[PDB]
Amino acid sequence: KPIRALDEGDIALLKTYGQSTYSRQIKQVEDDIQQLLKKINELTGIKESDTGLAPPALWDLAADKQTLQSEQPLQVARCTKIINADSEDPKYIINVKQFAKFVVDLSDQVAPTDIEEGMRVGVDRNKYQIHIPLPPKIDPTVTMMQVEEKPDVTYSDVGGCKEQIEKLREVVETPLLHPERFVNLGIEPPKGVLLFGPPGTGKTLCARAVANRTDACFIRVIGSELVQKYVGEGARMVRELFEMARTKKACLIFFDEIDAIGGDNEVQRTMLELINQLDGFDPRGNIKVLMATNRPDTLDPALMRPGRLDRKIEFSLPDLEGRTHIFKIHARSMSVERDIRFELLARLCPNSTGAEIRSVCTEAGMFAIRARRKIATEKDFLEAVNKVIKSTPRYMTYN
């Protein structure tokens, strides 16, 4: 049966034949609706942006004219090798962002002492001479460097990592709390430890707990930050943060997600600067560094060499007692019943990380919300662990 193309007569008949009497009117009205909407959107338009003009009470217009005429604009550049200035070769390599690199002299305003390698130099636009160093002035409350003084989490909050928390206690407390014992045992206090374990194990939380116990401020540094836009002057970032830590009292330096940094030119500058701030800075200081990443090998081989990071604490997935302790800790902040079998939930989620446990508790809360109940039940936790964990076979051949 060959298909027959719809003839013009068939097209005409099929269009009209059986149709609503109102169909023509409906189609016309709908098209007019679209045209009218387009017309409204055309005739509203031109929304005023109203740029950031302050009230006229603050305009010293003459002064702005004078600063426009006088004050020169300086491009921002990254400095490089000093090329042995020593008043005989006052020249430096400066990389003016994407524009280019140049070799430039100083300005009468600046001095050689405050200009070195690596900081932000404000070069002019004609001769490109460095006219003012601009330290990044980072002190970053707009981003990472947690700078939390006394983290809310405590020794009770961390659960399961008892061996881990004990090893951490030793290393970052026994020198910190009892320096005399290490002094009279004839050994330099532990220079640092690399807290390695599968992600989500809670190593960060355990570190913050000991920080709260030590009453020493906890500094957490991310790596992706200085992999992304804020690259380059990261050496000056760590310089200033270590400096303020020296100004600060007993401290606790903690590098998480440092795998990104360890795994490299400006990055290499960052770790040789921290070499200068760890080996060059006396190992007797109270700015103990707490290294922590899942990768135990991606760290640069020159980092864990003796006279530097000295031991390694191996965090592992929490056990049954650990899992039930984490469950109780996370459920304390939830509206649940008092007879929840948290040992049962810990059993039902073997080889489950702490993050998985908090997600299970969150899903239990959502399940309780689903039935519009103000209190989560054990059935909700069972369904939550059925959903999160496991992302007939185990019921018909095993028994």
Partner 1 sequence: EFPMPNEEARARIMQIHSRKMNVSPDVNYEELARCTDDFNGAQCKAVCVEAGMIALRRGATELTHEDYMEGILEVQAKKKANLQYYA
Partner 2 sequence: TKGPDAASKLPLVTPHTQCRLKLLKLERIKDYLLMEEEFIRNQEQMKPEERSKVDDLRGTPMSVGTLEEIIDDNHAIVSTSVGSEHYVSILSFVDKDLLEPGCSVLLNHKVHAVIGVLMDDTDPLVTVMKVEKAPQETYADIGGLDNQIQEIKESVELPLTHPEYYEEMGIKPPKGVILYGPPGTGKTLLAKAVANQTSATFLRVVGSELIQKYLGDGPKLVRELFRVAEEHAPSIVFIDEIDAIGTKRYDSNSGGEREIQRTMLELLNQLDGFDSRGDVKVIMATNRIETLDPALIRPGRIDRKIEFPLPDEKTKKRIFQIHTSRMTLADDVTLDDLIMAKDDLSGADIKAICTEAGLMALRERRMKVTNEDFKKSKENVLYKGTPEGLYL
Partner 3 sequence: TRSEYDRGVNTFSPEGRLFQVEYAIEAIKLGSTAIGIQTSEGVCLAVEKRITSPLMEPSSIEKIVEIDAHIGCAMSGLIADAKTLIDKARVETQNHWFTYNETMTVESVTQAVSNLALQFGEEDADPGAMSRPFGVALLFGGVDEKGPQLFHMDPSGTFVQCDARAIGSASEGAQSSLQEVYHKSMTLKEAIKSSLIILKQVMEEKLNATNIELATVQPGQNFHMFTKEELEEVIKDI
Binding residue numbers:
197-204
> Does 392 contact partner 3 by CB under 8 A?
yes
**Taking CB under 8 A as the criterion, which residues in 181-240 touch partner 1?**
181-182, 184-187
Rg (CA), the chain: 33
**Taking CB under 8 A as the criterion, which residues in 318-357 touch partner 3?**
320, 341, 343-344, 347-348, 350
CB of residue 189 vs partner 1: minimum separation in angstroms?
A: 10
Taking each helix axis as running N to C, give the angle between helix 266-275 and helix 234-247, from 0 to 180 degrees, rounded to the nearest 10. 20
State the Cα–Cα distance between residues 20 and 222, nearest whole angstrom: 67
Chain positions contacting ligand ADP, by CB under 6 A: 157-161, 199-205, 326, 329, 354-355, 358
- Which secondary structure element, helix H or strand E, spans residue 226, and what is its range? helix 224-227
Q: Which is nearer to partner 2, 75 or 174 (CB)?
A: 75
Contacts of 53 (CB under 8 A, 6+ apart): none
Q: Which is nearer to partner 3, 131 or 323 (CB)?
A: 323
Q: Which is nearer to partner 1, 248 or 311 (CB)?
A: 311
Side chain identity at 56, as an amino acid letter?
P
State the Cα–Cα distance between residues 173 and 189, nearest whole angstrom: 10
> Does 2 contact partner 2 by CB under 8 A?
no
Strand partners, 256: 292
Tell me the CA end-to-end span of the chain in Å, nearest whole number: 62
Q: Tell me the DSSP string of 276-299.
A: IIIIIS-TTSS--EEEE-S-SSSS
**Taking CB under 8 A as the criterion, which residues in 130-159 touch partner 1?**
none
Site string for partner 2, 164-203 (x = CB under 8 A): -----------------------------------xx---
**Taking CB under 8 A as the criterion, which residues in 307-326 touch partner 2?**
none
Q: Which is nearer to partner 3, 311 or 341 (CB)?
A: 341
- How distant is the alpha carbon of residue 72 from its chain centre? 37
How do beta strands 192-196 and 100-104 pair? unpaired
Q: Which is nearer to partner 2, 295 or 305 (CB)?
A: 295
Q: DSSP character for 84? A: S
Q: DSSP character for 22? A: T
**From partner 3, partner 2, partner 1, none, which one binds at residue 394 (CB under 5 to 8 Å depending on kind)?**
partner 3
Q: Which of 8, 16, 44, 86 binds partner 2 (CB under 8 A)?
A: 44
Place of tokens 């193309």: 5
Q: Which is nearer to ligand ADP, 235 or 331 (CB)?
A: 331
CB of residue 323 vs partner 3: minimum separation in angstroms?
A: 11
**From partner 1, ligand ADP, partner 3, none, which one binds at residue 203 (CB under 5 to 8 Å depending on kind)?**
ligand ADP
Contacts of 301 (CB under 8 A, 6+ apart): none
> Does 174 contact partner 1 by CB under 8 A?
yes
Instruction: Identify the burial level of 25 via C-beta atoms within 10 angstroms of its C-beta, where 0-12 means exposed, 13-18 middle and 19 or more buried.
Output: exposed
Chain residues binding partner 1 by CB under 8 A are 170, 174, 178, 181-182, 184-187
Chain residues binding partner 3 by CB under 8 A are 320, 341, 343-344, 347-348, 350, 382, 392, 394-399
